[PDB]
Design a protein around this ligand. Structure first.
Ligand SMILES: CC(C)(C)S(=O)(=O)C[C@H](C1CC1)N1C(=O)[C@@](C)(Cc2ccc(C(=O)O)cn2)O[C@H](c2cccc(Cl)c2)[C@H]1c1ccc(Cl)cc1
Length: 99
């Protein structure tokens, strides 16, 4: 229940975080049962959320469109590239408290 990337330092992906209410709701909707997570766990559950909500059907194009989903409100963008991992981390950090 974790996903990692070479674009971000490994240790950063172990950062302990407490999601604020919207982020926490999204994670719990796909089976998360806690209040505190590592970042790589947050990325896993958010990935599961994205696929469950059908926000990434075009696998070849690497754009996620989320303008009309809770995810769009969470991140503050209509769309983002799944390949820009630092940008994704930045957007997630705004929605949690770092322990
Ligand atoms: C089911 C899988 C295959 C394990 S997955 O990795 O969770 C699928 C998701 C998808 C829902 C968006 N996802 C991805 O597909 C991909 C593989 C997209 C991707 C494709 C190619 C390249 C490259 O060539 O450099 C880089 N990144 O990884 C996303 C990811 C993984 C770890 C950390 C981060 Cl920040 C993003 C990663 C992702 C993107 C966004 C978010 Cl919020 C969460 C995970």
């Amino acid at each position: 229940g974790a996903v990692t990337t070479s674009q971000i330092p490994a240790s950063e992906q172990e950062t302990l975080v407490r999601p604020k209410p919207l982020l926490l709701k999204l994670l719990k909707s796909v089976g998360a049962q806690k209040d505190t997570y590592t970042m790589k766990e947050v990325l896993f559950y958010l990935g599961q959320y994205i696929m469950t909500k059908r926000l990434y059907d075009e696998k070849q194009q690497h754009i996620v469109y989320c303008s009309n989903d809770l995810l769009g409100d969470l991140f503050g963008v209509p769309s983002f590239s799944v390949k820009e991992h630092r940008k994704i981390y930045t957007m997630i950090y705004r929605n949690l408290v770092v322990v």
